[PDB]
Amino acid sequence: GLPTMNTPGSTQFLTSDDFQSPCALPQFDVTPSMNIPGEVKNLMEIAEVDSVVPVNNVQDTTDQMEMFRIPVTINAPLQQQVFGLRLQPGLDSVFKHTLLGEILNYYAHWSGSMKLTFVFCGSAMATGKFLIAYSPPGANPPKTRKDAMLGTHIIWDIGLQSSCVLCVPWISQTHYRLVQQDEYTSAGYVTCWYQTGMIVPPGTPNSSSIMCFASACNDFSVRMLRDTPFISQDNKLQ
Amino acid sequence: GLPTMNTPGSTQFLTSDDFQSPCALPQFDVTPSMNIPGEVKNLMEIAEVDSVVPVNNVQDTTDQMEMFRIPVTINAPLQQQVFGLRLQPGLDSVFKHTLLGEILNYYAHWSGSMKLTFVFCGSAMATGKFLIAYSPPGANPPKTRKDAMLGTHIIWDIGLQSSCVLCVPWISQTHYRLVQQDEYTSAGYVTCWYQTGMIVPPGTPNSSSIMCFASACNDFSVRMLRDTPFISQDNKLQ
Amino acid sequence: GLPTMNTPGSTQFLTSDDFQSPCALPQFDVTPSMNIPGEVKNLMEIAEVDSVVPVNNVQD
Amino acid sequence: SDRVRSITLGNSTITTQECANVVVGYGRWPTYLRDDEATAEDQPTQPDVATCRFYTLDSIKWEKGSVGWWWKFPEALSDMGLFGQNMQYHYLGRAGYTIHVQCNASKFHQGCLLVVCVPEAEMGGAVVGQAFSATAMANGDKAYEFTSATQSDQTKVQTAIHNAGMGVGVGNLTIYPHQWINLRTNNSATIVMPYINSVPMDNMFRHYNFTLMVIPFVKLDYADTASTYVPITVTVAPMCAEYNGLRLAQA
Amino acid sequence: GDVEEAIERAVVHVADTMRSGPSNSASVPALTAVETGHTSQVTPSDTMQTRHVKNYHSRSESTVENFLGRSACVYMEEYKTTDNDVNKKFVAWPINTKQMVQMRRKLEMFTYLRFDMEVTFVITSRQDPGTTLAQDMPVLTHQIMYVPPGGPIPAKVDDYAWQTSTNPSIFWTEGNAPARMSIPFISIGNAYSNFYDGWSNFDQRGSYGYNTLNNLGHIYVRHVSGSSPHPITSTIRVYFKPKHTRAWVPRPPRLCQYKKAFSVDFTPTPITDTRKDINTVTT
Amino acid sequence: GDVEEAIERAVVHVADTMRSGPSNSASVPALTAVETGHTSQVTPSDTMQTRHVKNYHSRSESTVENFLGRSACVYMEEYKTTDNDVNKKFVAWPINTKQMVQMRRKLEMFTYLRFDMEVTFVITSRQDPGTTLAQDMPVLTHQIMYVPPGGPIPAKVDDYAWQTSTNPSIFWTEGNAPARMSIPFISIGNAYSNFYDGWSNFDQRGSYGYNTLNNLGHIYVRHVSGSSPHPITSTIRVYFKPKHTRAWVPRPPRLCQYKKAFSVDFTPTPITDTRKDINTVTT
Amino acid sequence: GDVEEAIERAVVHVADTMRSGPSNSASVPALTAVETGHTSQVTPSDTMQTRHVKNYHSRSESTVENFLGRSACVYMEEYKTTDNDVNKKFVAWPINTKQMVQMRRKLEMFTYLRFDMEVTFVITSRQDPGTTLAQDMPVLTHQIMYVPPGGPIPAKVDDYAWQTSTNPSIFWTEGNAPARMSIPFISIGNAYSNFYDGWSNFDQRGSYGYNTLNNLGHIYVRHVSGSSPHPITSTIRVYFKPKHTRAWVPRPPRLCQYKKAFSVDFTPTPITDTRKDINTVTT
Amino acid sequence: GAQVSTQKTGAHEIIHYTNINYYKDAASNSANRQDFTQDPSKFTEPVKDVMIKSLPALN
Amino acid sequence: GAQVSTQKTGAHEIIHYTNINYYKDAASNSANRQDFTQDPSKFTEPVKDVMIKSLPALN
Amino acid sequence: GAQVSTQKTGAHEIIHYTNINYYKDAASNSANRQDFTQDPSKFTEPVKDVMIKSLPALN
Numbered sequence A, B: 001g002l003p004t005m006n007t008p009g010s011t012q013f014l015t016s017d018d019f020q021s022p023c024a025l026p027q028f029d030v031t032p033s034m035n036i037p038g039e040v041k042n043l044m045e046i047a048e049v050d051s052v053v054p055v056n057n058v059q060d061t062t063d064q065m066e067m068f069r070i071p072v073t074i075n076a077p078l079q080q081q082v083f084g085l086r087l088q089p090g091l092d093s094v095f096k097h098t099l100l101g102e103i104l105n106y107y108a109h110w111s112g113s114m115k116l117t118f119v120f121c122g123s124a125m126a127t128g129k130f131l132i133a134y135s136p137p138g139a140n141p142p143k144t145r146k147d148a149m150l151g152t153h154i155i156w157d158i159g160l161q162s163s164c165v166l167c168v169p170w171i172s173q174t175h176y177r178l179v180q181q182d183e184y185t186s187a188g189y190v191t192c193w194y195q196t197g198m199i200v201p202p203g204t205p206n207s208s209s210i211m212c213f214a215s216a217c218n219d220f221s222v223r224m225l226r227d228t229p230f231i232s233q234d235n236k237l238q
Numbered sequence C: 001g002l003p004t005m006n007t008p009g010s011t012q013f014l015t016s017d018d019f020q021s022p023c024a025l026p027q028f029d030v031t032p033s034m035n036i037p038g039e040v041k042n043l044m045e046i047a048e049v050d051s052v053v054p055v056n057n058v059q060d
Numbered sequence D: 001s002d003r004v005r006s007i008t009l010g011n012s013t014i015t016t017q018e019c020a021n022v023v024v025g026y027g028r029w030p031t032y033l034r035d036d037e038a039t040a041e042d043q044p045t046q047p048d049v050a051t052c053r054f055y056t057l058d059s060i061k062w063e064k065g066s067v068g069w070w071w072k073f074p075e076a077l078s079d080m081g082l083f084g085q086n087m088q089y090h091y092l093g094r095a096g097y098t099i100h101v102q103c104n105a106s107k108f109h110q111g112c113l114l115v116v117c118v119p120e121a122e123m124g125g126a127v128v129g130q131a132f133s134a135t136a137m138a139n140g141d142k143a144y145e146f147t148s149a150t151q152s153d154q155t156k157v158q159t160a161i162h163n164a165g166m167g168v169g170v171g172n173l174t175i176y177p178h179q180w181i182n183l184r185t186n187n188s189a190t191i192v193m194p195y196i197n198s199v200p201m202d203n204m205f206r207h208y209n210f211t212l213m214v215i216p217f218v219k220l221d222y223a224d225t226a227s228t229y230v231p232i233t234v235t236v237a238p239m240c241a242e243y244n245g246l247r248l249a250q251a
Numbered sequence E, F, G: 001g002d003v004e005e006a007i008e009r010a011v012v013h014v015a016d017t018m019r020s021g022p023s024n025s026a027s028v029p030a031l032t033a034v035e036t037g038h039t040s041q042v043t044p045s046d047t048m049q050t051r052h053v054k055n056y057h058s059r060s061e062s063t064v065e066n067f068l069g070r071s072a073c074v075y076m077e078e079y080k081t082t083d084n085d086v087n088k089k090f091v092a093w094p095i096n097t098k099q100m101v102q103m104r105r106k107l108e109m110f111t112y113l114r115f116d117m118e119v120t121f122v123i124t125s126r127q128d129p130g131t132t133l134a135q136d137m138p139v140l141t142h143q144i145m146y147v148p149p150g151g152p153i154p155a156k157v158d159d160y161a162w163q164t165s166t167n168p169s170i171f172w173t174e175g176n177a178p179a180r181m182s183i184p185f186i187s188i189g190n191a192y193s194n195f196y197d198g199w200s201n202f203d204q205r206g207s208y209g210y211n212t213l214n215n216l217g218h219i220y221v222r223h224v225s226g227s228s229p230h231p232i233t234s235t236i237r238v239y240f241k242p243k244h245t246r247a248w249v250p251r252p253p254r255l256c257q258y259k260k261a262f263s264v265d266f267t268p269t270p271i272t273d274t275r276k277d278i279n280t281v282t283t
Numbered sequence H, I, J: 001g002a003q004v005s006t007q008k009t010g011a012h013e014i015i016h017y018t019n020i021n022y023y024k025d026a027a028s029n030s031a032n033r034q035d036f037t038q039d040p041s042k043f044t045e046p047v048k049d050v051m052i053k054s055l056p057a058l059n
């Protein structure tokens, strides 16, 4: 017949190949298609939805739900820190298990900007201002508000609109960053400080809580599929 | 020659493949074709023919032919049940070995409507009315005629026309049903009741019989060939 | 299927061959290209640059 | 003003004067089944106004120590007006829903609730293995309470709140159609759910289409007032309901 | 075209359901008479109100071509590379389709069949147990010989008849893909007959039944020249696969178990299984 | 064309960044209200000065087709060529996707799935240890049988059921490429369901959960005729690879470890790991 | 076209030699000044009489594509099918190109490189010596697993991590052609860097050199299920072959021998070999 | 010499495949498993006089 | 019967490849891993009334 | 979809060869080892002012 010669790679089984194969059930009639609501075509669509971030990981939380709320008090020194965290969406315990971190943990590289949304859940009569800042990578994280305000930041005024958005820009030397972030691909820090202080009238609770939401922007993307390290087994399930 | 590489599945023998192969008798002259009467091109053509249903399986039938006839009597309580059966064409003992059940037992899925035809084989002077009802799946089969009449039914009047047809509609949540029906894919029940009662003049037998025929409609179809469990062997035939 | 016959050299691995092979990372998005200064396309370009010759090899 | 909303279904009306927008399922509005997707052959019945109307689903108390509640549908409406009768008498059913949750408090209270509709909210038992009857998670319109500590009774579901009874992070329920009730801003939440399933119709007694959950993320707090608790009420209205397969009742 | 010709088939789809409303008339579609030998053609639209339904189900998988187009085993036998008994070192099978029950029943649903055939051979070998098994043996080779009726038959593994000059044969080496070939329609009549209600002699005597029309030949198999110091046993399996099938005169499927390979003989069997009474509907 | 038709797809690319300057106005893009269930669509251009950037990044590798288009192991088991226990010489697996944790979690990120399947089988053999191992055995052959629900099931390695006339099967010889095939969408419903919050009986009793909808059949495997003087053990691995995938209704990834193959049962788990205090940012 | 498109390249050929005659003028092509950093462009035609010569020599084989387009070994290691030490039954290599001297030096003639990769695996097995070697073992099978950075790593030959659902893998059976695949440009930066004169921490501390930018992942290898009664040792060799190459900023070839796999450390070496005196020209 | 014809639908619904014959005998071709014509009247309506479903059968 | 379509970019950037179908079932085809359409509005903007980003949300 | 291009000369001097791509990724293609453009001015003449070979360099 037609002369041929086999090249390297013949008879190998590569788990990510694309080849045609015979059908074991010839002329099988499949069930007609139906347009079920809520079709998802790309995982970034899932990644772009907000999810509550457990910022309050203080190592002595006897109640798990306490992790989601950030405490706030009426009387505090003029400049004081509300919270601080590292911007490692796929590695930091804060973002590790969120709806965005779970998607990232299936991939090796990521790039793009992020949205952090903060919502004030105090009384309607309470008021205050907060300074939320993003500090790009450096040798030392900010220690005071004076330091924090030198980076990207927004002044948040609490009023009828209960929510404010800090958009973390994509500032990097490389087009992509590793999910298993190392010192070479650091991403910076995020901190929140009192701007004016929280004031309340008579007959209101003396403490309030804030919550944080994390999601990706429309320029976010991922690359290089890999297996997630969060799930494992020791024996075959039965 | 032409470079090539083999993919997975080479040198395998799949019993349902479609490939060309060399002919062992080159240039063989086949006998001319002849148009024998009664060509069959699709098994549904066979499945659409009526066949007698052995409804009278009363566990004490000393004569096998007694299975095909359903007894009827002149004097009966005002409301009484003639027969009852489950609508499992491929699994129920009633329909298992009929001309339709045998075809179904070669397949795994089925769908479409069914025809049940009843014929009265009494005397020409006998008369009566019967109520034949189909009850879709539910937690309890009907116990009385009052219950049965809430479902699909037809009132059958015995006269010059000896036969009446109950068409069982296709009411299901899924496009297809399993032949090895389980509780998830139940299909309902069929029952027959006295509507008025059987009346006879003097000089006639006091008992009569009915027969049932089962067949598929023109929207019936099957899927997923499989081996039938009705036939088996323990040693090679000789 | 299509009749064929293998010729000598089948299943050999020649280190200087040119054949197509499957990609292990389908639909991978490579980083955009950038024009770094000083692209070299042929080794003769390197060979044509001057270099100091150690002529005084006097063994002491 | 866009903070006022009015909804009219059948012979019932809902008015809210301090509310957020309306969330519509996955962007799809409820609609009747088309001719090219149906499978059942007999004519459907469409009661219309007799069934598509608002039903009030009893009421509960929000305390400082509350952890959360859930309802399973359409079981929650199984004995409510003519909707329950049509459920009992028919083999198949299909309908979308409008869910309205009311919760009002003064300007001096604080707290936040998450309202979310979870399709196919399969739940696990308290003791791995074993089994539980259909009374540990649905007994009519009564609400079932989550638990702060891990459940121990083998006869009921694992009610640990932080896992939502499904083995998933409670904070990720934002992926489903949802809305928040924050006492500073709004006092109601409205969600329109289309019919979501893998088959055109299904039996309404055997299968739970979706589960409604109300979870306090920020616990209620107040000081120096005579109001000790904040009631929460749930109202639901089927939309575009149709049934098939009449038979004897019960199910 | 010349290079590319375009064929055109078509999906068929089952009949749709038409909308039906209330009726009150003299027509009686439901009432009929089975005495005519006519199967009623009523549809649910004729006895109850129905909605319009567009079906897309097709009867593609029910065609006889697809029903019979599956490879099925028809024979297996064993032969040894070396032994004292000459007859046990090769196989000799008179071709027929009545040996294996499943394919036999599939075929006997029709009275006459006409098709091409695709034959596949699966051969495996194993070493026989013994007190000493240490040996080195190269790969074995096998020969399959087809002898049309009337041809010479080999009487031993090294007979002259194995030098086929006109009988087709296949030589196959272990470790490769199974052997395969195609066979045309080789019947003297216009169609194969699964059943034959007649005799061989003109005065109604002699052989009776389908045994009279089975003259398809024989198949022989051997190890080409393998003869190991220790015995080795090989098994061959034959698979048939009809192609381009046509069938006539369907007949009811068999109910009783098979008992002979060349006869219809049987033992009476009950029509079906029993139940408590005519009203029992529960499990 | 006729010989060559030209298709045309397109790169998409993520959104570019537009130049933004200083602003002072009544518009407040940064302020929103999450109570509406609406995720904010702000971009860095709306809260700080930015330069014009042309992105060429694409989301090609995040599609569900590529995400789920990788072969993953779903089952492995061992069977011996010869042994005293009959049940230990062949395998019988009810098909399901809940046995292996990784692919299970990948699938359960969606509620409903619809895809074709590509199945690959990897088979390896090894000699069992013993006091005497010297033997010569030819290459082994294996059979994989698929039995749709309701079909006959073999009870021993040499049962009659292995003579498949309608059940698809594959015969594979060691030393070749792994076996492979394609399977269409074989669900009775319009889509596969990973979760089923319902019961089997109409009165809310019986089996609960996805166990009710698993009726995909069985897979059986055996050595065709190999029976060595000394035992030999073989292991089979099954790999699934979705094709032409469609998904609906995403749901959050699981947090707790799996404990049962046919249940959602779990043990409560902490939301995440802890740190010294809310301000700790160092390693 | 549509079926056949015609490409068009071109031979280049080196410069020809032009005829030159006697000259007497003020121009001085031979005299120049190297202080400018300019390499003189004089040709023999400018300093002596020459004939016309038409050269057909081409520099085809000196291109970087051809220079670097040869498969070269980058790593080899051994692993045993059965042993008491768990760590010795599989391999785990952090991918890098500094292990083997020849290809390392070929690559380090350039500062930045950008190319696709073609990887080939050569695997061989041998039986370990011992007092008793008589056994029968079927053909072995091997698995090669690639784990991008941050993924789970197997800790033993039969760990769960080997059930790759997203990590690419290859299963290869002995006796066939070597395995092969293609890899795209997988760097986060715009080009690979052979050298990196910098630190990891921002305050100039921590790791130094190219060790900081090596985050390409790992490769794991094992016997799928082979476990012989007697030990068997297998060796794997990995070959890399750049494709579609581009290079920037050439640098002088290394003179000193290599001593570390992740450092430039060296021992001082003489510039070149010596000779008797500056006039010695004989052998 | 190449035939082009449509292939059966599948999930997600160039639905074309190419076929060439290599052998000189028509028996060597692949199965023609794409014919779907059928007519049950030979077995369901074997009567001589046409019967109208809406009319009464016997008279 | 042969489809010609572009192949994904790579380093150094006839970027065309040819495909032919050999089997009669659409399930036998290779994966269609070159569709890149997406629309997140179903999950990010499920509200009824359109919200303008520059305007205030509630009133 | 088939490219036709000339192949390198050899002894005794249809000097044409045909190529088709089978895979969907450009990384799967064969090496492009037939480009022969080169320009040494970047390394041999990196000076700003153009220098004429016949003229004196410095002044």
Ligand SMILES: COc1ccc(CNc2ccc(CN3CCN(C)CC3)cc2)cc1
Pocket (backbone or CB within 6 Å): B024, E095, E096, E097, E117, E119, E146, E183, E192, E193, E194, E210, E213, E214, E215, E216
């Ligand atoms: C030589 O390669 C061969 C030779 C023979 C065969 C078998 N061919 C064959 C077998 C059976 C029927 C059906 N006939 C039904 C009526 N019965 C009396 C005889 C058998 C037709 C052809 C295959 C390959």
Ligand SMILES: COc1ccc(CNc2ccc(CN3CCN(C)CC3)cc2)cc1
Pocket (backbone or CB within 6 Å): A024, F095, F096, F097, F117, F119, F146, F183, F192, F193, F194, F210, F213, F214, F215, F216
């Ligand atoms: C015969 O060759 C085969 C046979 C079966 C298979 C497996 N096919 C398969 C397996 C799993 C799902 C997903 N379903 C999700 C809902 N769950 C209740 C059942 C499984 C679909 C198809 C492969 C090859």
Ligand SMILES: COc1ccc(CNc2ccc(CN3CCN(C)CC3)cc2)cc1
Pocket (backbone or CB within 6 Å): C024, G095, G096, G097, G117, G119, G146, G183, G192, G193, G194, G210, G213, G214, G215, G216
């Ligand atoms: C998974 O199949 C693979 C995986 C990895 C590889 C190796 N790929 C590779 C190796 C080396 C360089 C050159 N880089 C130079 C700068 N140095 C810091 C890192 C290496 C690029 C790619 C092959 C196949």
Ligand SMILES: CCCCCCCCCCCCCC(=O)O
Pocket (backbone or CB within 6 Å): C002, E002, E003, H001, H002, H020, H021, H022
């Ligand atoms: C024995 C025939 C071998 C055919 C080999 C494959 C086809 C090669 C030619 C390309 C297709 C064109 C066929 C035709 O012109 O009809």
Ligand SMILES: CCCCCCCCCCCCCC(=O)O
Pocket (backbone or CB within 6 Å): E003, E004, F002, F003, H002, H004, H018, H019, H020, I001, I002, I020, I021, I022
């Ligand atoms: C079963 C089909 C085998 C096809 C073999 C490869 C193609 C040979 C013909 C050359 C390409 C032309 C195809 C066409 O005309 O559409």
Ligand SMILES: CCCCCCCCCCCCCC(=O)O
Pocket (backbone or CB within 6 Å): F003, F004, G002, G003, I002, I004, I018, I019, I020, J001, J002, J020, J021, J022
């Ligand atoms: C996956 C592609 C397989 C291609 C097989 C070889 C080519 C067969 C068709 C003959 C060449 C024509 C190609 C074309 O039309 O562009």
